Amino acid sequence: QIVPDAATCPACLAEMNTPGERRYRYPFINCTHCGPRFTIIRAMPYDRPFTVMAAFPLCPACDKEYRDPLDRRFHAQPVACPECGPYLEWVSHGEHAEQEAALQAAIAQLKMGNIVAIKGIGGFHLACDARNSNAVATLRARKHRPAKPLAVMLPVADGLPDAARQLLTTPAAPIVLVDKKYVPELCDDIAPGLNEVGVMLPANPLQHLLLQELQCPLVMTSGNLSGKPPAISNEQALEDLQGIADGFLIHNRDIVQRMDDSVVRESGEMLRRSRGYVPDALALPPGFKNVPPVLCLGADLKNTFCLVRGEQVVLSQHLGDLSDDGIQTQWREALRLMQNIYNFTPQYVVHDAHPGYVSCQWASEMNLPTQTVLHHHAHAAACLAEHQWPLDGGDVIALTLDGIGMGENGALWGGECLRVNYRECEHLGGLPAVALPGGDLAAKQPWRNLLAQCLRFVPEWQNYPETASVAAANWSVLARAIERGINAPLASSCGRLFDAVAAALGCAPATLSYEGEAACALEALAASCDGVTHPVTMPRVDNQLDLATFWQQWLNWQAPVNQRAWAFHDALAQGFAALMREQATMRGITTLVFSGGVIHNRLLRARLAHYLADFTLLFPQSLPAGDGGLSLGQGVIAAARWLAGE
Ligand SMILES: [Mg+2]
Ligand SMILES: [Zn+2]
Ligand SMILES: [Zn+2]
Ligand SMILES: [Zn+2]
């Protein structure tokens, strides 16, 4: 049984910090309890010759420890020391150093406020002093990343809440999102416009050496070029990051598996499940047994695949956007190793009903029976599965809130009330479908969604101060395209409604730099309001929320921006609660399910829970509410259909 890549243990950290130890300051120290696992395995069985370490014959002292049954390094497969192992290399515009001198060059660069690329366990990071405004502005400039929050590595967890420290210090060593007020040392460009910062602890020997020396917070963000997957080879890091890093601290131990840092909230809520969790299998819910080998492809964004068999499922690491340049290489290596580990050969493939997906094209190429699952069905089913809802558990009413997923009959969904079981999804209602003006541009430019909302719902929309920029434009050409259905498909998208409101409030740039940016801004703004008496509502007309009434009341309720943002979250939750309550009570359903990336919104969760105290409420916690949990939902649905003899 292989275990996830594990944070350097206290015993290895002590050995590395003890002068006179053969492994004193050795940046590759590991033992049977810690070190890289999944990221250094070429093939099963887990044995040095089938790892990245086959290239490094052990010296006699290492070999004795590896063979000694009582030694902490007994069969530590990637074991090494300075004599026989990998070593550091420094590269910087015609400078070169090795070993300790390489480390020191990287340290000197970081202190002067430069950016260094650092080789990690599962890829490379870009690092700089997180207190240094200039360094962080430079990193943002070079990476064309003006807003997206940067992960920061702290030397210690001191000063953080108990819950954060506990998560930070596990073998998994995730990034943990923490209120930025706990970390005043960070410059303001770490998470601009947001209330939280992703903090992490050193969890490999190199990181410990760096933070021990530096004693300050360090930006520790993914070493990628935008639109590409992270580099895993030195040669790819050097190419990809040349415009960005001032120098490169690399080494000659290969990484074979892309494995990003995991990301959780302090509350324990899973956002991205990679390093430290993969490749642990999970038990399927009660009633799922003897399941055939099923490969589930997930969806195109925030991708994970899932292998289902027997009574367990195993999810891949996060693979990101499947449209990125050469992402198939990493996706396929992950699939090869995962199938090798679990001796798995699929008999069935499951993928999303969206016919334009890359993953769906990959599924067509496998020579296996294929079946599709609706995106929002899979969201709801992943949440059910996580909560161990039995195979014969009964129907729930589900609320699935996201950006875009293909619904029934070619409709674009994103804000739906559904009657769900593992085998069935019936659409009951939700948000009205509203045009996406300019198609893919709608997700990048919030004003487009405000325009689309106003055209549909707001008489004399041009007269409100909140629509001024849109009104000033020649918006009428777009209005014409919307009318004629020219690259303006209808979507009942909760994400785009967020964007429209954010556009009206001016709390995001006119053009976004990352997906979800306007919605994150709006949530961060609403979060500073502790609740307010307000008249804004979203009534229900049939089984849809009445946005005409919402816009009329919201646009005409002047108040501080945070309270306007709060009132929107509150009205949206109340409106969806009323829909779900009617649907569930009249079917004798007592349990409600929530999923989709928008359900990551804390305030919405809280308002929903507030309004729905008369129901058992199921929210995602150990898998992402977003597309990262989707493959699991596809897998339980396929399994349930198979178990029913369909
Ligand atoms: Mg503090
Ligand atoms: Zn160890
Ligand atoms: Zn050795
Ligand atoms: Zn989704």
Nearest in space to 338 (alpha carbons), one of 360, 308, 361, 298? 308
Evaluated on CA atoms 75, 76, 77, 82, the torsion sign reads negative
Task: Give, in degrees to the nearest 5, the angle at Cα 372 between 366 and 373.
Answer: 140
Task: Name the token pair of 303.
Answer: 């991708």
Token pair 């209005």 is at which residue?
A: 479
For the chain, what is the total number of helices (H) and then of strands (E)? 19, 26
Task: Name the token pair of 153.
Answer: 């590595």
Cα-based distances in Å from 462 to 16, 191, 202: 67, 34, 53
**633: part of which helix (H) or strand (E)?**
helix 630-643
Way it was determined: X-ray
The answer to whether 374 and 353 are in contact (CB under 8 A) is yes
Q: CA torsion, points 496, 501, 503, 504, in degrees to nearest 10?
A: 150
Nearest in space to 602 (alpha carbons), one of 578, 580, 619? 619
| Nearest ligand for residue 203 CA | 2
Q: From start to end of 51-103, where are the E strands?
A: 88-91, 96-98
The Cα 173–Cα 175 span in angstroms is 7
The Cα 505–Cα 560 span in angstroms is 10
**435: part of which helix (H) or strand (E)?**
strand 434-435
Reduced to 3 states, what is the DSSP secondary structure of residue 617? strand
Q: Which homologous superfamily is 375-624 in?
A: ATPase, nucleotide binding domain (3.30.420.40)
| Nearest ligand for residue 620 CA | 4
| Nearest ligand for residue 600 CA | 4
Domains 1-151+202-255 and 273-374+625-643 fall in the same CATH topology: no
| Nearest ligand for residue 30 CA | 2
Report how far ligand 2's centroid is from the alpha carbon of 14 (Å).
9
Token pair 């050995």 is at which residue?
A: 15
Report how far ligand 3's centroid is from the alpha carbon of 40 (Å).
18
The answer to whether 183 and 197 are in contact (CB under 8 A) is yes
Nearest in space to 38 (alpha carbons), one of 278, 248, 247? 278
The Cα 207–Cα 27 span in angstroms is 8
Report how far ligand 1's centroid is from the alpha carbon of 152 (Å).
13
| Nearest ligand for residue 183 CA | 1
Task: Name the token pair of 160.
Answer: 């953080």
CATH code 3.30.420.360 for 273-374+625-643: yes
Report how far ligand 2's centroid is from the alpha carbon of 65 (Å).
13
| Nearest ligand for residue 156 CA | 1
The Cα 70–Cα 547 span in angstroms is 69
Q: Which residues surround ligand 2, an ion (CB under 5 A)?
A: 9, 12, 31, 33-34
Report how far ligand 3's centroid is from the alpha carbon of 108 (Å).
28
The answer to whether 210 and 107 are in contact (CB under 8 A) is yes
| Nearest ligand for residue 165 CA | 1
Report how far ligand 1's centroid is from the alpha carbon of 266 (Å).
15
Residue type (1 letter), 77: Q
Nearest in space to 603 (alpha carbons), one of 501, 494, 505, 525? 525
Count Cα neighbours of 567 within 13 Å in the Cβ-side half-sphere. Answer: 22
Look at strands 175-179 and 263-265 and give their pairing: parallel
Task: Give, in degrees to the nearest 5, the angle at Cα 494 between 490 and 500.
Answer: 80
Reduced to 3 states, what is the DSSP secondary structure of residue 248? strand
Q: How many CB atoms lie within 10 A of CB 644?
A: 11
Report how far ligand 3's centroid is from the alpha carbon of 337 (Å).
28
Nearest in space to 614 (alpha carbons), one of 425, 397, 431, 420? 397
Nearest in space to 564 (alpha carbons), one of 464, 435, 456, 472? 464
Nearest in space to 4 (alpha carbons), one of 62, 60, 49, 46? 46
The Cα 637–Cα 526 span in angstroms is 36
The answer to whether 241 and 250 are in contact (CB under 8 A) is no
**Architecture category of domain 1-151+202-255 in CATH:** Alpha-Beta Complex (3.90)
User: Phi then psi for 183, rounded to 5 degrees?
Assistant: -130, 60
Alpha helices in 25-98 (DSSP H): 60-67
| Nearest ligand for residue 217 CA | 1
Can you give the C-alpha Rg of the chain in angstroms?
26
Task: Give, in degrees to the nearest 5, the angle at Cα 464 between 459 and 466.
Answer: 120
Q: CA torsion, points 341, 347, 352, 355, in degrees to nearest 10?
A: 120
The Cα 219–Cα 198 span in angstroms is 10
| Nearest ligand for residue 495 CA | 4
Report how far ligand 2's centroid is from the alpha carbon of 116 (Å).
26
Show Cβ contacts of residue 444 under 8 Å, excluding neighbours closer than 6 positions: 511, 512
Q: How many CB atoms lie within 10 A of CB 463?
A: 11
Token pair 């690329």 is at which residue?
A: 117
Kindly list the domain boundaries of the chain, sorted by start residue.
1-151+202-255, 152-201+256-272, 273-374+625-643, 375-624
Q: How many CB atoms lie within 10 A of CB 367?
A: 7
The answer to whether 153 and 218 are in contact (CB under 8 A) is yes
Evaluated on CA atoms 61, 67, 73, 77, the torsion sign reads positive
Where does 152-201+256-272 sit in CATH, by number? 3.30.110.120
Task: Name the token pair of 234.
Answer: 């030195």
Report how far ligand 3's centroid is from the alpha carbon of 53 (Å).
12
375-386 vs 630-643: helix crossing angle, rounded to 10? 90
Task: Name the token pair of 264.
Answer: 């959780």
Alpha helices in 169-254 (DSSP H): 205-214, 234-240
Asked whether the bond before 279 is cis by omega within 30 degrees of 0, the reply is: yes
Reduced to 3 states, what is the DSSP secondary structure of residue 265? strand
Cα-based distances in Å from 150 to 115, 445, 532, 557: 13, 22, 32, 35
Reduced to 3 states, what is the DSSP secondary structure of residue 282? strand
Residue type (1 letter), 550: F
Breaks in the chain, after residue numbers (C to N greater than 2.5 Å): none
The Cα 481–Cα 267 span in angstroms is 45
**143: part of which helix (H) or strand (E)?**
helix 133-143
The answer to whether 486 and 536 are in contact (CB under 8 A) is no
| Nearest ligand for residue 62 CA | 3
| Nearest ligand for residue 87 CA | 3
Resolution (A): 2.0
